[PDB]
Symmetry: C3
Subunit: 252 residues, 3 copies
């Protein structure tokens, strides 16, 4: 028997917008520690990894560990029925085939109350080795979104060169080519770099533009890179957990 | 001869948005009492009933009773050419085959001036057998819109249960099911109920979502229900008249 | 070796929105006087004429006269990557097949830097002479846009009657017909007329609605007309140049 109550419902809405189009089906690993999700996209290229620790919920109770299989598109449709200021409460009986959801308003005259059909999923757990990275760029989520969205019009791949001065996003294609140079810095939204070794890597823009759907979760985004290992795009669900997107660099 | 002058042109624009897609053709009953319209939708399920009393117009003159047949899509297109703050004046001669429209600006340096071709129409006026109703829910137009719009994603029909405490909108379907519980209030935008007998009725959501296009006419909406009789969704065109939608409940 | 630097980048963004759909390909005539463009639309009905004088650029250098052929849709896509407050610098190194563009942000955190492939085009640019016109209507760009956009729902053509009192836009079609009467005024957004002779002319609304994509360049628009000659819709790129659209009246 499971019962997590989250006051910032917006978090839960924003998460499923960032995921519904990248992954159709996924397995929610519920624990006393918190709510986890780990999955690869439809086409087995990018890896998603959600962590919502139990400290971050206003109430939390989890007697048995659940492994709820969910259609993320279906779950997104239900969370559309929640206002952004609503207090969302997840609940699941022990002997269960469904997840309940209860949206309370700010006024609390209104009380929405949904029940979602679950499903069977035999997806396999994956290894996320704890790797230290050469370059670690911290920048604003919106600027990373803007950049990835813009270079899409130029080309199908972005080349992220990274030095000590700043970071450089490049792209080539039919109509021409482009270079977006961002230097280090400042207050709130600032570009900062922890750089062991210089890195240059190529990534499909198609997939980065899926990751940037998480942009509403965080003012900042962190990109972590080393050669011959997957890029980690991390959006911090502040004071609560994270949403990490992993992506394999191209070989060319 | 006919000449109604309405200062709040917006009213007339908002009306035809609420109707153009639900009914293609309709007969405008002009009278000394005011402008009326009564019609069933394309597919003979829902009944629409507009009343704009002559007290509510800033000028009003109607010598003979007219029965002007109108393509509501055509009339909508002309009212798009009116600004929201424009002063709209309807005018028609004796042996009429056309409706005039006159848009005066609030800057007063522009004067649009349209003429709309009318048409022949056969209208069998159903006796709307004015009833007293079991439940009469008054709530905010926007919340009714939100609710109907949301539950569409869950299912094809809404079940409006109504008690003394509040009102409960339910829906079932493929992905799961949902319940939106709205309670009454003490003390602008408030849920209030006049409840003779408890009522539970099912309605197609498809049609309620058509009715909610009238939402711009009024901050509040009133739902009136009794068993085995049609639901009345009433949007008040304040200090002027109303726009009522009738709908047949489903049969269990 | 061309190098124009424009502080109001927005100008350059707004221009290419007003052009990309009307003309696919066009030839940019660069000169010491400034940047010019002259072209007819895809379907050889309307004539476009851009002038950006070199006084209006914050830096300007042009050693040789260039004739850069450009895919305006491609160039539009690059200018989307510029913010509205960005400082846009055009540059071309004459032993060249490409024009570079560099957008710096006002704060200068960021410096985007693009390079666009050019193309070969048959510079078949036959000019039209500086006519004096019967009616010259000056009105707000937004109202002209509104009017053209609205009457489209009524009909496929607008009849611009013009008198001393004001100006009258008419249209007929299936559902009915309409008349928008705008009178003159006695100072920001005002309708004013220089009227030698009275004029009535018909124009395809389809094309005027393409012209009104220039509306973001200017608070006002000027319509110039005489019988049996093309209508000039002029959007002033203030303190800098203009963007003129020419259109043949119906018969």
């Amino acid at each position: 028997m499971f019962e997590a109550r989250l006051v910032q419902g917006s978090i839960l809405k924003k998460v499923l917008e960032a995921l519904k189009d990248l992954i159709n089906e996924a397995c929610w690993d519920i624990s006393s520690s918190g709510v986890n999700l780990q999955s690869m996209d439809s086409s087995h290229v990018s890896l998603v990894q959600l962590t919502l620790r139990s400290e971050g919920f206003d109430t939390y109770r989890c007697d048995r560990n659940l492994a709820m299989g969910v259609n993320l598109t279906s779950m997104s449709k239900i969370l559309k029925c929640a206002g952004n200021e609503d207090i969302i409460t997840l609940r699941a009986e022990d002997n269960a085939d469904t997840l309940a959801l209860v949206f309370e308003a700010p006024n609390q005259e209104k009380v929405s109350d949904y029940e979602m059909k679950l499903m069977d999923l035999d997806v396999e757990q994956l290894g996320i080795p704890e790797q230290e990275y050469s370059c670690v760029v911290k920048m604003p989520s919106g600027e990373f979104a803007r950049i990835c969205r813009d270079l899409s019009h130029i080309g199908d791949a972005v080349v992220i060169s990274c030095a000590k001065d700043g970071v450089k996003f490049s792209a080539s294609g039919e109509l021409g080519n482009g270079n977006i140079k961002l230097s280090q810095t400042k207050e709130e939204e600032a570009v900062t770099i922890e750089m062991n070794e210089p890195v240059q890597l190529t990534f499909a823009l198609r997939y980065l533009n899926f990751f940037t759907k998480a942009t509403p979760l965080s003012s900042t985004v962190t990109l972590s890179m080393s050669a011959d290992v997957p890029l980690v795009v991390e959006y911090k669900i502040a004071d609560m957990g994270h949403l990490k997107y992993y992506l394999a660099p191209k070989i060319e």
